[PDB]
């Protein structure tokens, strides 16, 4: 089970093992210590495409966060770590969300400029098109949306939206640009998602690793 070779071959077919997809950046940082408790460590600095681990039947992918649910649901990864925001916006129907890893905590919120409430149908700028619609629907409301990928705080300042929906941590980026957080839509944290087929047929390998990650978190 142990492996110390950094150039251990983990290429091609890996149906016998687990392909673990990690979000790059902050989620990676907070995830790697947890994984260590399950005897899964990298043998190289990523910043220095598929990576082997200290476990011979586990290999790691480092993806953009958006791709993690895609890879997991399609079975290109057996399991992955994604923000609750990303998961729920993508659609969570084709994966299992087994663990709250309780890392990268933030809040999905509405936000705006003492702006007067506008008269007609509100326009929301967001990358979270679906979550925006569900939230407003829960209030008995419906909105126009413009999908943006970044610099969400700009949208109200140049008239692309009346309000935004975005993740808020410190909320300093907002205060900086004359915006304020308004309503909390939900609490967000990183989650361990598993491909359904993988979960059903790879219990022997998954069950102990999942249990160890659980212990590590609590």
């Amino acid at each position: 089970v142990r492996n110390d070779d950094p150039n251990f071959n983990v290429m091609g077919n890996f149906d016998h093992g687990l392909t673990l997809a990690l979000s790059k950046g902050r989620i990676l940082k907070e995830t790697l210590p947890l994984l260590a408790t399950a005897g899964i460590n990298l043998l190289e600095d990523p910043e220095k495409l598929i990576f082997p681990t200290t476990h011979k039947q586990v290999r790691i992918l480092i993806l953009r966060a958006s791709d993690v649910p895609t890879y997991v649901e399609n079975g290109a990864a057996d399991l992955g770590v994604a923000g609750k925001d990303v998961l729920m916006e993508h659609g969570a129907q084709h994966v299992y969300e087994l663990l709250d890893l309780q890392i990268a905590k933030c809040k999905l919120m509405t936000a705006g400029k003492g702006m007067e409430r506008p008269k007609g149908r509100l326009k929301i700028a967001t990358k979270y098109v679906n979550l925006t619609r569900q939230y407003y629907a829960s209030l008995g409301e419906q909105v126009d949306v413009i999908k943006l990928y970044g610099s969400m705080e700009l949208a109200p300042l140049v008239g692309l939206g009346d309000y935004i929906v975005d993740v808020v941590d410190t909320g300093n980026t907002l205060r900086a640009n004359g915006l304020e957080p308004l309503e909390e839509i939900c609490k967000v944290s990183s989650r361990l998602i598993v491909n359904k087929a993988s979960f059903k047929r790879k219990q022997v390998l998954l069950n102990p690793i999942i249990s160890q990650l659980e212990q590590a978190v609590q």
Partner: protein, 361 residues
């Protein structure tokens, strides 16, 4: 102008030969096990196809003014046949193999037009009907393809349903739980379960392991559990080389499933090769309520060699026609040159007829 829609493709001859052969042998494998072939309608009134949504193509019937659908799934159609059209007083077995259409690809499928093959067993209550169906499904996959490295996932919705009943949960609570289980969203499940909430949580946490489940947990619940345990044993007997697993909160289409759940997974595939279940009273919408269990698969998922063609010269001389007829009799594909065409008119030619004999090149 040649462009096909997304998710729609020709099945050209090389692939068609393989799928056609596969189609016939599957129908025939079912036939000799008592499953009678039917063709279901391609179009029906929408209410008939929707007795069990967005996936169905919809068109107006000019004759009635009512909305039609193109079939997305033949399961409810055969239910109608068994419930109303052929009300057989006893056990009945049918099968089908045909294109269904989806407005968008389902189940990570490439095609909006899968070739759905399936079988239905009506009129027998006991678990043994499910055992037959599982056995038939496995047998058909083995015949068509291979069970090498395959995995059978067995479930039973009666466990969840029984616990819902005993705990006296409302329909809204039951519906909310079924969503949480189907996503196995265990963090949310913890919060949502905090009456008999610890059993509801246990059902999700220890879904894959009967022993661990029974340690962390009623006539109906026990009957469902026995039904699953008996099935697990019999199937493990009949198929010793097959990996079998358990998932007691597999609740796909919970609303019309009433017992055992069964699907077969394969290496490097998100979608199962085949899935089925017990769904008693599936046809009650159409008439009599009938015990029913069945499965279906996409035949393209169980599925392209080249085709050999013999070229003979133009002519109607008896000895030549005779040789052509004998060749065709043995199942060879023979064509004759037309007019003044030479052999280069058939560039895909593999053999020649030239006594008349067949030679390569």
């Amino acid at each position: 102008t040649w462009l096909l829609p997304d998710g729609v493709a020709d099945v050209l001859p090389e692939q068609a030969q393989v799928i056609e052969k596969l189609r016939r042998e599957a129908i025939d494998f079912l036939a000799v096990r008592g499953y009678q072939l039917v063709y279901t309608p391609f179009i029906e009134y929408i209410e008939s196809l929707s007795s069990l949504d967005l996936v169905t193509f919809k068109v107006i019937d000019q004759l009635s003014g009512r909305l039609l659908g193109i079939r997305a799934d033949m399961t409810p159609q055969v239910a109608r046949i068994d419930a109303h059209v052929r009300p057989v007083e006893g056990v009945a077995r049918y099968c089908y193999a045909g294109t269904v259409l989806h407005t968008k690809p389902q189940n990570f499928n490439a095609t909006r037009a899968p070739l759905q093959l399936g079988a239905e067993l009506y009129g027998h209550d006991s678990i043994e009907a499910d055992v037959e169906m599982v056995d038939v499904m496995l047998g058909l996959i083995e015949n068509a393809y291979t069970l090498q490295g395959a995995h059978l996932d067995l479930g039973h919705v009666g466990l969840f349903r029984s616990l819902v009943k005993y705990a006296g949960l409302s329909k809204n609570e039951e519906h909310e739980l079924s969503d949480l289980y189907q996503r196995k969203a265990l963090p949310e499940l913890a919060e949502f379960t905090q009456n008999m909430g610890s059993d509801f949580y246990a059902l999700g946490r220890y879904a894959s392991d009967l022993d661990a489940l029974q340690a962390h947990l009623d006539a109906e619940f026990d009957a469902a559990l026995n039904a699953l345990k008996t099935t697990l044993e019999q199937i493990k007997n009949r198929w010793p080389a097959l990996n079998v697993g358990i998932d007691v909160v597999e609740l796909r289409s919970y609303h019309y499933h009433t017992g055992l759940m069964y699907a077969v997974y394969a290496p490097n595939r998100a979608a199962p090769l085949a899935q089925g279940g017990r769904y008693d009273g599936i046809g009650e919408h159409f008439g009599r309520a009938r015990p029913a269990t069945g499965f279906s698969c996409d035949l393209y998922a169980l599925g392209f060699a080249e085709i050999e063609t013999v070229v003979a010269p133009k002519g109607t001389e008896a000895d030549l026609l005779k040789a052509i007829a004998n060749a065709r009799s043995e199942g060879l594909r023979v064509v004759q040159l037309l007019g003044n065409d030479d052999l280069s008119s058939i560039p895909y030619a593999t053999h020649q007829l030239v006594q008349w004999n067949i030679e390569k090149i």
